Design a protein around this ligand. Structure first.
Ligand code: SRM
Ligand code: SF4
Ligand SMILES: [K+]
Length: 462
């Protein structure tokens, strides 16, 4: 089961309660951070179905209704301009409440984004509010609509799509624009085929300008031109970063977001002990990591000692920090190939390739989905693996670091040794032929290794 938790923000009181439930009332005993900034339990003792909704209520949390088609609303967790988080989080939470129960055809995903960071992967979402600020205060949002990554193997009527720019709106019209987008999707969405009901398909059927025009009419606003924004990356800021005031944020890399006491690495007990002394709250990131947020400088050495000792600060390569996998087996009923349990050893092999070609300090945004529903967001990666059968994946290449391009399929239905043999060849070509600061995804496009995806509804499929 899964929780509503806008922006990933969770208090220490809430953390201790979900930690107790996980340890005592689930089969796996783990807390799993998701890439939509919330958490999951796995294998709830069906003896404890009622107790989980009361445990959650006991600390001020609610679970979504699965008939309810909205999902968790994301918000940039660790903005470089640290003062912007409070206003942005406030709006993510406002949008979240405003869309709580208008029955939708398909599920609906929303984000609040703070440039230059695209950690929340806006182009995977139906509705995106890109924050624009003046003098350290929010003034409004650029609206991008119509992203979604789910596809069906072999079905060229399905496709991943990035999101389309509509225009800028002042802060005052946010809730109105949000509802206008939702109801327009609700009314114009396909009533015959579930598989065609997503906003990306509606937008392609009626045209972007037709959809934008209806949203303007319903919201009683006109869109201003887009105000300038640029993204520089999608990773988390692992380690200490200086927040506002004398506060500090410690971002901890958690492999697969899986929080459990392991031999010599008591990740779950360490976070408990941190929770009990930490003066602030936690932030779950869209990269399945955890921020100890708002640590006063005086408290840094105490927090870091616990995290150090528990294994929560074991150093990993930049590659491993920028790699992700969905849950997949053993718990997902839709899974086709391993993802979570495949990734650690697969990145071991990638680490070796990266060292052998002398690029062990750089990274390739690399992701694995266990099936083409796309939960791992493989369809926005530089290198994406999409599960097809046990041990077999479609290999996609040619996304970019900032997640604004769909990678085209490169090789179909191949095994891990075959994937590694191909990546070895390509990483070597990249190591020697790349220009200054050129990403691997961009390189495969430039070197003619793969043709880019320019208009996915039309040219994703060869
Ligand atoms: C946990 C998570 C992956 C992760 O490793 O973090 C996940 C796990 C599952 N997703 Fe998801 N999805 C997760 C992010 C996503 C995202 C990525 C995102 O939202 O940023 C996508 C792709 C973007 C998109 O929606 O287009 C995604 C698209 C889906 C879909 C396909 C939806 C569609 O439009 O066709 C399904 C299957 C379905 O809905 O029928 C799905 C279904 C599932 C289910 C519930 C499988 C099922 O229907 O029984 C998975 C449960 C596995 C398990 O045992 O835990 N999940 N799923 C993410 C939890 C997020 C959350 O808290 O709400
Ligand atoms: S992508 Fe497929 S396998 Fe991976 S979690 Fe989502 S549904 Fe399960
Ligand atoms: K992670």
């Amino acid at each position: 089961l899964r929780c509503r938790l806008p922006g990933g923000v969770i208090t220490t009181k809430q953390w201790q309660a979900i930690d107790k439930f996980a340890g005592e009332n689930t089969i796996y005993g783990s807390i799993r951070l998701t890439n939509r900034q919330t958490f999951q339990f796995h294998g709830i003792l069906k003896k404890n179905v009622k107790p989980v909704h009361q445990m959650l209520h006991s600390v001020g949390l609610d679970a979504l209704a699965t008939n309810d088609m909205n999902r968790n609303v994301l918000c940039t967790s660790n903005p470089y301009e640290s003062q912007l988080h409070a206003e942005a989080y406030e709006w993510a939470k406002k949008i979240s409440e405003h869309l709580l129960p208008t029955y939708l055809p398909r599920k609906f995903k929303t984000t609040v984004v703070i440039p230059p960071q695209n950690d929340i992967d806006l182009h995977a979402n139906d509705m995106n509010f890109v924050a624009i600020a003046e003098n350290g205060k929010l003034v409004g949002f650029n609206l991008l609509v119509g992203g979604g990554l789910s596809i069906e193997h072999g079905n060229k009527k399905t496709y991943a799509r990035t999101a389309s720019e509509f225009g800028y709106l002042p802060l005052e019209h946010t809730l109105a624009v949000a509802e206008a987008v939702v109801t327009t999707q609700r009314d114009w969405g396909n009533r015959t085929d579930r598989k065609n009901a997503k906003t990306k398909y509606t937008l392609e059927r009626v045209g972007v300008e037709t959809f934008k025009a209806e949203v303007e009419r319903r919201a009683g606003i006109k869109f201003e031109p887009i105000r300038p924004y640029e993204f520089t990356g999608r990773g988390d800021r692992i380690g200490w970063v200086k927040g506002i005031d004398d506060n500090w944020h410690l971002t901890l890399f958690i492999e697969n977001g899986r929080i459990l006491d392991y031999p010599a690495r008591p990740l779950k007990t360490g976070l408990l002990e941190i929770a009990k002394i930490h003066k602030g709250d936690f932030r779950i990131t869209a990269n399945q990591n955890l921020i100890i947020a708002g640590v006063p400088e005086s408290e840094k050495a105490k927090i870091e000692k616990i995290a150090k000792e528990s294994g929560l600060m074991n150093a990993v390569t930049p590659q491993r920090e920028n790699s992700m996998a969905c849950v997949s087996f053993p718990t997902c009923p839709l899974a086709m190939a391993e993802a979570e349990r495949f990734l650690p050893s697969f990145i071991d092999n990638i680490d070796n390739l990266m060292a052998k070609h002398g690029v062990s300090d750089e990274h390739i945004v690399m992701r694995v989905a266990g099936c083409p529903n796309g939960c791992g967001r493989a369809m926005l990666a530089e290198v994406g693996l999409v599960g097809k059968a046990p041990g077999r994946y479609n290999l996609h290449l040619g996304g970019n670091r900032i997640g604004t391009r769909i990678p085209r399929m490169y090789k179909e239905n191949i095994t891990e040794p075959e994937i590694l043999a191909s990546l070895d060849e390509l990483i070597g070509r990249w190591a020697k032929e790349r220009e200054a600061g050129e990403g691997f995804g961009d390189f495969t496009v430039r070197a003619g290794i793969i043709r880019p995806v320019l208009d996915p509804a039309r040219d994703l499929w060869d």
